[PDB]
Structure 1
Amino acid sequence: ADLEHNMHTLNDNLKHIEKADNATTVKDALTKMQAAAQDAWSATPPKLEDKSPDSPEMSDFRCGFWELIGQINAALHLAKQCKVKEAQAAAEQLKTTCNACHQKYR
C-alpha cells in the first residue's frame, strides 16, 4: 500500500491499544503495526522526491523506521506473556520516535 495508508494503520491501531482491557486486543493490534512499518521502510516521502536514492536524507529516513520496528517487536514480546500494562506503556513511548521524524520529513 501507499505511505499514506501505512500511516493510517499505525495511527488507528495505536489508539485501540490505550483503551484495551484484554491481552488479545493488544496482541492483535501490535501485529498489524509490525506489518505496516515494514512496508513503509522502503518508500520515498514527498519532501525527498527530487533527491537521489543514495542521499544522506534517504539514509536517515530508513534508519528511523528500523528503530520503530525494534520497539514494536519488544512490545509484542511483552503482550505474549500476557503483561498488558507493560505492553501498553511500551506503546506510549513510541510517540517520541514518530515525533522526531515528523519534524524533518513530514
Structure 2
Amino acid sequence: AELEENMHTLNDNLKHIEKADNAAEVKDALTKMQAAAQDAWSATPPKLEDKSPDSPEMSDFRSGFWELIGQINAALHLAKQCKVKEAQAAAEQLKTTCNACHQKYR
C-alpha cells in the first residue's frame, strides 16, 4: 500500500488497542501494525524525495521504523503473555516513536 495508507493502518489499530476489551483484539491489532510498519520501512517519504538512498536521512527514517517494529513486537509479546493492560501501555509508548519521525520527516 501507499505509505499514507500504512500510516492510516497504524493509527486505526492503535485506537483499537486503546479500546480493546481482551488480549485477542490487542494481538490482532498489533499484528496489523507490524505488517503496516513492514510495508512502510522501505518507502521514501515526500520530504525526502531528493536524497541519496544512503543519505543519513533515509538511514534515519529506516531506523525509526526499525525502532517502531521492535516496540510493536515487544507489546505483542506482552499480549501473548495475556498482560493486556501492560500491552496497552506499551502501545501508548509507541507514539513517542511515531512523533519523533513525524517531527523530522512528516
TM-score by length of 1: 0.97
TM-aligned CA deviation for residue 81 of structure 1: 1.3
- Residue 52 of structure 1 aligns to a residue whose secondary structure is coil
Residue 50 (structure 1) shift: 1.3
1:54 CA displacement = 1.5
| Residue in structure 1 matched with residue 56 of structure 2 by the alignment | 56
Show structure 2 runs of 5+ residues with no match: none
Task: Tell me, in whole angstroms, the C-alpha distance in 2 between the residues paired with 1:20 and 1:63.
Answer: 29
Alpha-carbon distance in structure 1 between the residues aligned to 2:98 and 2:23: 24
Quote the offset at 1:73 in angstroms: 0.4
1:13 shift after superposition = 0.4
TM-score, with structure 2 as normaliser: 0.97
How far did residue 78 of structure 1 move? 0.7
User: Alpha carbon RMSD of aligned pairs, Å?
Assistant: 0.7
2:36 is matched with 36
Deviation at 1:85, TM superposition (A): 0.6
- Cα distance in 1, alignment partners of residues 99 and 86 from structure 2: 22
Q: CA deviation at 1:52?
A: 1.7
Unaligned runs of 5+ in 1: none
Secondary structure of the residue aligned to 1:93 is helix
**Structure 1 position 86, deviation (Å):** 0.7
Identity of aligned residues (%): 95
Secondary structure of the 2:82 match is coil
**2:77, 2:99 → 1: CA distance?**
24
Q: What SS class does the counterpart of residue 25 from structure 1 fall into?
A: helix
Q: Cα deviations across residues 3-39 of structure 1 (Å, max 9, x unaligned)?
A: 0100010000000111111111111001000011011
User: Which residue pairs with 2:5 in the alignment?
Assistant: 5
State the Cα distance separating 1:59 from its structure 2 match: 0.9
Please give the alpha-carbon distance, in whole angstroms, between the structure 1 residues aligned to 2:81 and 2:22: 12
Look up the SS of the partner of 2:17 in the other structure. Answer: helix
